[PDB]
């Protein structure tokens, strides 16, 4: 009989002012990091936050309530330690990885890659991939930005919630 | 007069 | 629309004849004792608001007067000419003591800043210029209109200066930085008049197309007063909520600010020897109480209007009609 609905949902759906994105969470690699994302999603922590950073042909980053890149906190209080596991690497576009200021300092901030960047492997905790909506990701990856990589009009995460499937509608 | 604290540079 | 507020009819009771050319200014002294008027006879005449008596004529301008303002903070009167001169008149000597030089063609509006010692004047040449009324120094030139400007109104809070132009735009200006940041393009025709409602954060502007209402500071749009399809060039707005628009064809409409209902049309009849063309209006001001209106007329007369009282509110009513 299937498992009951519980916080280890395999997917998380983002509803945004650019379209809808689904993320596949790699529970067998970074379970503390995934449940941080899924809990903060469940707690509406990312609802109303913005993608404060966009670097063309590199990375899309968001998930700071202040939009500064300095804010945000994990469910464990502030920082928690990395879950580096080199069976996962930033092999291409649409890898979902947790942003950190330094080793073992993961917070709430996350980023989506746009290129193979394997020399960055082991410095950031990969914890999923874009499940669907990569066309939206490519559209965001070409929006032109100021010299601090902040969008001149925001992309706002208007809702985030966990889901049992990658479906988007 | 009232005022504020200008942020300097850092290394 | 919603619920016109009832306002008493306006009635006429003066014709002051004595300009030898069109009248095109009025302003009422802060004291409410006297008002000044300026005319195409190049003379400024000072009239006594209650008696209507004349008691000055000031002959300094060179070809035509058409701007007058009495400062609400200094004993000075400012005036602007089609002769390209802005003059300062000192109401302790009745002589002239300042000239503000830089306008390249006819001045046609001026305003005196309600709390700074700063004066702003519109002209042909499609600019307004800001003056320091102490030093005569010019310390902004609001180029940005593309055709002749003639209205400016000032207020202490941003936007400190509002200007209206024959390019059919209103502009809102940052008087500190000297830049513009609005263009209220919605008029189809020359915006010849402005007024800021004396107790709301709101202002109206008039063109042959429509009279439009606007919410400050943003400059966002509020519903239009329409059907006065003449060449308009006056607005006066009242502490009680009346606005009045006078037109070059001599017709004169009174309106309720809150609803845009029109509840008077007065057609002026011009004084002897002038009838058909000359009927036109171009000035208006309210006295400081807001209970008398003064209009200046192409028939070379000043006329003054007053509110009826005798049995009005029951005979007149307004219903609901949203």
């Amino acid at each position: 009989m299937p498992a009951p609905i519980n916080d280890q949902a395999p997917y998380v759906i983002l509803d945004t002012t650019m379209g809808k994105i689904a993320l596949e969470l790699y529970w067998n690699h970074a379970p503390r990091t995934c449940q941080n994302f899924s809990q903060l999603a469940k707690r509406n922590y990312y609802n109303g936050t913005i993608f404060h950073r966009i670097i063309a042909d590199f990375m899309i980053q968001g998930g700071d309530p202040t939009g500064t890149g300095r804010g945000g906190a994990s469910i464990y209080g502030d920082k928690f330690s990395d879950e580096i596991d080199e069976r996962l690497k930033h092999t291409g576009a649409g890898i979902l990885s947790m942003a950190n200021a330094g080793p073992n300092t993961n917070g709430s901030q996350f980023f989506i890659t746009l290129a193979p960047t394997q020399h960055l492997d082991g410095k950031h905790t990969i914890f999923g991939r874009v499940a669907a909506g990569m066309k939206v990701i490519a559209n965001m990856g070409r929006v032109d930005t100021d010299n601090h990589d902040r969008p001149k009009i925001e992309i706002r995460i208007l809702k985030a919630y966990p889901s049992e499937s990658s479906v988007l509608s | 007069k009232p005022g504020g604290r200008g942020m300097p540079a850092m290394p | 629309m919603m619920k016109p507020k009832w306002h008493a009819p306006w009635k006429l009771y003066r014709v002051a004849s004595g300009h030898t050319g069109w009248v095109r200014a009025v302003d009422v002294e802060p004291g409410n004792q006297w008002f000044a008027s300026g005319g195409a006879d190049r003379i400024i005449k000072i009239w006594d608001l209650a008696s209507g008596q004349l008691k000055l004529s000031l002959t300094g301008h060179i070809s035509s007067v058409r701007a007058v303002k009495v400062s609400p903070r200094h004993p000075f009167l400012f005036s602007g000419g089609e002769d390209k001169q802005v003059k300062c008149w000192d109401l302790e000597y009745n002589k002239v003591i300042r000239h503000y030089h830089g306008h390249l063609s006819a001045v046609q509006a001026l305003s005196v800043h309600p709390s700074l010692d700063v004066l702003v004047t519109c002209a042909r040449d499609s600019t307004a210029r800001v003056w320091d009324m102490r030093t005569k120094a010019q310390v902004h030139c609001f180029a940005g209109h593309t055709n002749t400007v003639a209205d400016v109104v000032c207020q202490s809070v941003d936007p400190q200066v509002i200007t209206a132009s024959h390019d059919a735009t209103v502009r809102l200006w940052d008087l500190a930085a000297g830049r513009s940041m609005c263009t209220l393009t919605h008029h189809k025709k020359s915006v010849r008049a402005l007024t800021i409602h004396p107790r709301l954060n709101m202002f109206a502007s008039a063109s042959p197309d429509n009279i439009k209402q606007w919410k400050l500071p943003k400059g966002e749009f509020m519903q239009n007063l329409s059907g006065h399809n003449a060449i308009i060039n006056t607005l006066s707005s009242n502490d009680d909520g009346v606005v009045v628009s006078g037109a070059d064809n001599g017709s004169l409409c009174f309106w309720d600010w809150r609803s845009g209902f029109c509840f008077q049309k007065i057609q002026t009849k011009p004084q002897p020897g002038s009838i058909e063309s000359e009927a036109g209006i171009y000035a208006s001001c309210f006295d400081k109480t807001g209970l008398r209106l003064i209009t200046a007329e192409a028939d070379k007369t000043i006329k003054m209007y007053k509110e009826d009282d005798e049995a009005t509110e029951e005979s007149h009513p307004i219903v609901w009609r949203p």
């Binding site: 649409g94 991939r129 499940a131 | - | 209220l184």
Partner: protein, 179 residues
């Protein structure tokens, strides 16, 4: 899937690259080649920013007037709050702010009519070992006899107008044959 290896953009479907397959993955044109015109973009109210043309070339000024919410008649007999004239503190703070800038300007303007700097140079080659410099500024003494140094009646055309504001009229009243 770890027995499979992707080889083209078809192989990913609508998802992104797979981090568990240690091969170079390009789900679209992204990252294949190398890195000047605004993108078409959605607004926070769910529409799409075709109007964004009108915001190029300005200081982020108030003139967003390019939708139609802002030309249709907003409410009559308004709910008075923002529509109230601002308080006494506002006219005082505004008036004091306006003069204090122009005052400092006017003093230099009629003139037209120790102190140090600490410099932190992004060019990291630097002075020896120093991430910053500290430096003394002195003013060249103006010779009170020397006449104006340079010809300044040079004249050039008026700077281009700020980019057009949308024209925002009501629809044309047609009045064709008789009028």
């Amino acid at each position: 899937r770890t027995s499979f290896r992707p080889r083209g953009p078809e192989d990913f479907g609508d998802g992104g690259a797979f981090p568990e397959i240690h091969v170079a993955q390009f789900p679209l044109g992204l990252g294949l080649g190398d890195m000047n015109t605004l993108a078409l973009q959605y607004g926070t109210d769910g529409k799409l920013q075709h109007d964004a043309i009108a915001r190029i070339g300005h200081v982020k000024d108030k003139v967003v007037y390019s939708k139609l919410n802002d030309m249709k008649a907003k409410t009559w007999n308004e709910d008075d709050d923002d529509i109230q004239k601002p308080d006494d503190d506002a006219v005082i703070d505004a008036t004091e702010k306006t003069r204090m800038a122009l005052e400092k300007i006017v003093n230099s303007k009629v003139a037209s009519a120790a102190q140090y700097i600490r410099y932190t140079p992004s060019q990291q080659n630097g002075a020896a070992g120093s991430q910053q410099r500290i430096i003394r500024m002195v003013e060249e003494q103006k010779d009170p006899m020397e006449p104006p140094k340079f010809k300044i009646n040079q004249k050039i055309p008026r700077a281009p107008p700020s980019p057009p504001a949308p024209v925002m009229h009501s629809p044309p009243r047609k009045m064709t044959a008789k009028d």
